[PDB]
Structure formats: C-alpha cells, structure tokens
Ligand binder design. Structure first.
Ligand SMILES: [Zn+2]
Ligand SMILES: [Zn+2]
Ligand SMILES: [Zn+2]
Ligand SMILES: [Zn+2]
Lengths: 408, 408
C-alpha cells in the first residue's frame, strides 16, 4: 500500500479548482490535467474498460480476483477543488508525530490551532498534512482519489479475494455538476460509495431534501409626494414575507436533524423585488410542509393588490435524501460497518446537512453512501489531513471489497 | 401679449430632456439648443446684461421703466424636460373650446379622460394643448419659460410701470442640478419667483425638509448546513429594521402635511446588505425626530453582533422647507396674492410634497416661492395645458412687476 502519500501530493500539486456558472463540463482545464494523469495511471495499473467521456468523467474496472457470483461494487471520487479558495500553488506542510501544539502555516501570521479546532487533540501522534496558509489543501476530494487509486494497487498486488471493482472520478462536484452526466449504465456497479467524507469513522447515508423557492414581487412605483393609495411598495411586501418566516428555523439556529428556511438573497426597488429562498429538510413530509408554509406566507402578504401587483413563487426541487434508497438494501451499510470494525474503527454516522453526488446517483439507480477520507476543514486554508486516516480509508475500501466477495 | 402660443410651441418642438447621473451641466446638448434660442430672443428683445454661463444658466435684465427706489425682482424657469418620458419629437394637439369629452391622443389607443382626470371638468370652454400620447408635452417647464418671455415683451411694449426685472433659465432642474451653479450675486434680485407650478391659482411657499438615510449592513456568511451560532444573516437584519418603520407613515398612506419614511431600494446577500431610505417632513422638529427614529430602530436590531457584524447609518440632508425664508418678508406673498386678485384669480396655496429649486435658492439668499403655469399631469404622456391658464400666468407676472414698482 505504497505511494499513497506520493499519489496524494502529486494530485495536490495540480490546480483543479472548479468554476461556477460555466456551461462547459469540466468547467476548467486543470481538471482535465488530473483526469488525464489518472487515466494513464489506471492503464499502467492494468485496469480494464478505462474510458474518459467528453464530459470529463473517468471510469475503469479491476476484474474479479476469484470466481463466484459476486456483485460488482464501485468507488467514486471527484476531481475538482472548491472555488471558495485557491487550490493553485498548494505547498503542503507535513508535520510528523504531531504533539498537539499550534501549527504555523507557512511564513506569516497563519495558524492551525487546537483552540479553534478541538479535533487536533484527537490526533496526537499522527502525521498531519496542512497548507502554507495561502490556499486550500485539496484533501477534499484528492485524498479520496488517492485512497481509491491506492486501494486498487493493494487489491491487484496482494492475495485479497474480490469481485469486479468499478471506479470513477468526476469533474464539477463543487459546482453541482458531479453526477449530471454520470453514465450509471456504463459504470455497471450494483452499488457504490463516494470516498468524499470527513474524519476516520464517518459513514453517511442521510442527506437533506432540497428545494429553492424564488419569489417575484411586482409593486407600483410613483413619485413619493403623491403616492397615497396609489403606490404599491414591493420591498415592503418582501420584508413582510420574510417577517413571517421562522427565525428559529434558520441556518443560524439549527443543527443535526432540524430543517430550515433560508433567505439567500434579495434585491428590489419600489416597482419590483426578488427573493431567493432555500428549504432543507431530512423528512419528506416536513419538506412538503415547508413549501406549503412559504406559499401560505405569500398568500397572506398578497392580500388585496390591484391586479397589476402580484407575488409569484417558483419552487424547484434540487435533490432528495438517499436514506430510503440506501437502507432499502442492508448489505450496503452492513458491509461498510463490518469493514470498519474489522479495521478497528468505530463507525460514526451523522446526517449530511446538505447533499452529495452520492444522493443524486442514489436516485439514478446507484445507491451510494459516503465513506470517510480522513480530511478536515474542507473549504479553507485551515484544511488538513492525517496520513493514518488516509491509510485507514484505504484499509476500509479494501476490506469492503474483500467482504463483498466473501458473501458472493 | 402675442407670440405666447408661438413661443411655447417653438420651445416644445426642441428636445431638451435631461439625463440622470451625468457630471456635465447641462447634461444634454438639447438644453443648450433652447438656451441659445432664448439668449438670441433676449438680445433681439433689448434686455441688458444678458449672459450664458459655462454651466448653461441664462440671465438677463429688463431695466426700470420709471424712477424711484424699487427693488429688483426676478422670474425663473428651467429649460429641461423630465427623463421619465420622452420630450423628443413632441407633436402638440390643440383642442379649441374643449367641451368636456375624452381627448383622443394621436392615432391609436390613447386618451386624455375627465374620468381619470376630473380637472378637465373644471376647464370647459378653454383651449387645451395635449400630446399625441407618444411623449411628454414640456409644459413643465416650457410654459413658464414662454410666460416669462411673454411677460417681458408685454412689460417692454406697453405703458406699465416697473422696476428692474431679472430673469433666469436654468438647465438640469429635473435631475436636481437646477440651483447648484446659480450665481445669486450676479442675478441681483431682491427676491424672485419660479414660474414652475401647476394650475391657475397655485402659489407655493412650503416644501419638505429632506434627507436620505443610507444603511450598510455587514453580516456573516458560511455554508448553511453548519451555520449554527456562526452565521449572521444581513438580510434578516434589513427586514427587521424595515419591520420597525411605520407602515402608516409611508408615501402610500400620507397626504397634504404628513411626513414619512420611505424605503427607496435595498439589495443584499447573507454577507452584506444595503438600504436607501428617504425622510420627508414639513416640520423641522419632526424631521429631526424622524432621523432619531431611524438611528434608534437601527440600534435595536444591532443588539449584540459579533464586532465584525455591524449596521451603519449615513444621514445626508438634501433640502429644507422655504416657509421660514419666504414668510420672513411679507411683501413677497402679499404682492403675488394681490396680483392674482387684481387678475380675478383665487390664490390656491398648497404645500409642496417634495422640493423645488426655489427652496434651494431661498437658502442661498434669494427667497423664492413658486408661481403657477397652467399646466397639468407634469411627467407623462397625459401632460396638458390650456392657453387661458398660460395667459393668466403672464397677467400675474406682469401685475406683480407693476405692483412691486407701485410700492417702490
Ligand atoms: Zn467539498
Ligand atoms: Zn468533496
Ligand atoms: Zn418637473
Ligand atoms: Zn418643473
């Protein structure tokens, strides 16, 4: 199981940052750089049916080790790094046998601190890989790419029985295009896992049901000095709508399993205004309830307006909670959990307050929970990872593949 | 008193529309076209000390008719037409002996209607001048320019005693630059009147005290799924501020002498938001009270925010109510009122729910109330005027000049 570190740093050195609002997929050339590198490494490795689509999705198959009717399983990672910070000229910082202090990031006033991140006191003794403080690290999701790549080297070069293993590396996960052009048919996996989770132990199979609620408000402007009973202030309606939305059921005041309404943005004048709301909820019923609530709030404020003044709502479903799709087949989480115990890891299962490409794929015919990576503080300069956590991800992937063949 | 109509139509044919947010004054070439025309006509008329500044303000003096120590008075009109509708290729429509029906504007579905404008039933018998329905008319303020120009022809060509009469024609009244570069010193008028009012009888000397209140809100954005006790939604603060502003004390619900708060515009995201409020009030005390109220409302919402999240208010005074400046010298309104009675007109004195260049000049050393013009429905395609009302404006101006010399 060597070259884990090497593969990781190699991938980290490549600028693969994604770009919002681009029509082309992948959105940036850098991503094609890493995809081509992976493609070559897969060929050299000896995988079969390797293919890189025009949309930049890399697929490949490691054939069964043994005979028997074993279901093919898959592992998926995404190639791009967050637009929220640069993954440009990352300069990794390796801290062997971390003793628990503050980590200086590069030369300057930048620090990885256990005061700010208590998790560190949970990683005494390990090798930490950090940034110089001037960029992202890319652990998300290049540690996953490295771990999958590594798990394949281990499966191919050791006496470990396994069925067919499908792997994929996708392009614009960060900008929401991760599963858009995913050819589940070509992939040919009975089920899969994304290796795009957090710390050691993380296993996720529950995510938010999501929807956007756009509101278009048309008022009536006129010179203010003579607006009596004539002027319809659109912003006054916007404020009245938001006044009715539960301030206790908002991102700033929810945690764990509680849903919410959130006003992302709003802009307007007396004549027109627009609001962009989002609704998140683990429960499909309370998700519906949440749409109703908004429409209801709207009606209220839309009391009696001179039929040239209205309030329109446009509700768009973004994604659903996989729970149902995953739990529907017990072996998926059972194998993953048994695999972690076999590797002396305590499975930690927290719900995802957001979504994942796995949740999209789970509705496209590929139930697909999330596996940990060992990385932390995902989108900023405080992002870091530990080699041991990365080696455990490898161990788990390899065990899951062995266990799957065992039962097949 | 001829060429009133002719001068009017001539001026109406010139595109003199102003333009918002231009640094140059006048903001448009068309205005210089009318200013040059007026300049020439003043020369031909025989006025003295005629001058056109680099900023496009035209001044001129008609010397005293008689001797005695008579105070010089002035008459002011503005040359540009509203940006709110085109004053491009105006095609006037003349309706002699209006009998009270609906007036068809040009060829098409456009109408001047007494149902929509009850004033018409107050103008039976008169000659109406309307638009074709495709533009503004320009009565505001080209009727005033014509009336002043005409009043001067009458004063110069008839046995009517008068002291010195100063006249001025200003450039960007519509875009707020009307009195900016007004050289009151060069003008040399003890007091003046703007001929920029409405229907026959109108005399205005009270206007709003005005101020803008800008609010900058800095919040704290973070991915929503993990914003608990961390995310500070700036829009939520904006809505909470506007929630505290009196919906009964707003443009849509005030009239006559009642002040108000008005939210002109607002834009924002979770990280930042901005609000542009205006405050209008005839009373200087309640104007102050209104500033206090806003600052107060702000404090409340600014409760306890992590010192990286704040709410800043920036209050800018725009203009004041002239009342004080005008009433301070009784002859100004006394002469104007006596003049209207001498002309068999009932003086109508309503407060201006907004401001005028006269109110700005009144604080620059030139008390300056507003005189009627006979025009109605100022900024749209439904703008119209009546020749009789225009002739009365002329009569009043001429009488005011005669009365002023009488008492001097
Ligand atoms: Zn991410
Ligand atoms: Zn990721
Ligand atoms: Zn106007
Ligand atoms: Zn005007």
């Amino acid at each position: 199981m060597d070259k884990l570190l090497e593969r990781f740093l190699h991938y980290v050195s490549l600028d693969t940052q994604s770009k919002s609002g681009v029509r082309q997929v992948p959105s940036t050339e850098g991503q094609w750089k890493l995809l081509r590198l992976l493609k070559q490494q897969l060929e050299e490795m000896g995988l079969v049916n390797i293919t890189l689509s025009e949309k930049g999705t890399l697929m490949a198959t490691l054939p069964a080790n043994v005979e028997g009717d074993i279901p093919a399983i898959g592992f998926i990672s995404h190639v791009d790094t967050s637009p929220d910070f640069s993954g440009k000229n990352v300069n990794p910082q390796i801290v062997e046998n971390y003793r628990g202090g503050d980590i200086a990031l590069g030369i300057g006033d930048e620090v990885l601190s256990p005061v700010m991140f208590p998790v560190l006191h949970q990683l005494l003794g390990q090798t930490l890989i950090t940034t110089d403080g001037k960029t992202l690290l890319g652990a998300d999701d290049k540690a996953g790419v490295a771990e999958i790549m590594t798990a394949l080297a281990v499966l191919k070069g050791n006496p470990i029985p396994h069925g067919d293993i499908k792997v994929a590396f996708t392009p614009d996960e960060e900008v929401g295009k991760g599963a858009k052009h995913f050819d589940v048919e070509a992939f040919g996996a009975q089920w899969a896992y994304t290796v795009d989770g957090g710390g050691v132990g993380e296993l996720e199979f529950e995510n938010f049901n999501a929807a956007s609620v756009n509101i278009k408000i048309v008022g009536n402007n006129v010179h203010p000095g003579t607006a009596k009973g004539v002027m319809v202030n659109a912003l006054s309606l916007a404020a009245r709508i938001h006044a009715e939305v539960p301030a206790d059921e908002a991102p700033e005041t929810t945690e764990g399993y509680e849903g919410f309404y959130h006003l992302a943005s709003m802009k307007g004048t007396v004549d027109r205004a627009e609001m962009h709301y989002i609704i998140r909820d683990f429960d499909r019923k309370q998700f519906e309830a949440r749409k109703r609530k908004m429409m209801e709030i709207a009606k209220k404020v839309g009391k009696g307006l001179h039929p040239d003044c209205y309030i329109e709502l446009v509700i768009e479903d973004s994604y659903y909670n996989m729970r149902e799709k995953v739990v529907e087949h017990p072996h998926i989480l059972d194998i993953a959990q048994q695999a972690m115990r076999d590797c002396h890891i305590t499975p930690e299962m927290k719900p995802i307050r957001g979504g994942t490409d796995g949740a999209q794929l789970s509705f496209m015919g590929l139930p697909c929970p999330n596996l940990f990576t060992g990385g932390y503080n995902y989108h900023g300069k405080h992002e870091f990872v530990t080699l041991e956590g990365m080696e455990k991800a490898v161990q788990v992937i390899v065990r899951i593949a062995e266990l799957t063949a065992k039962r097949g």
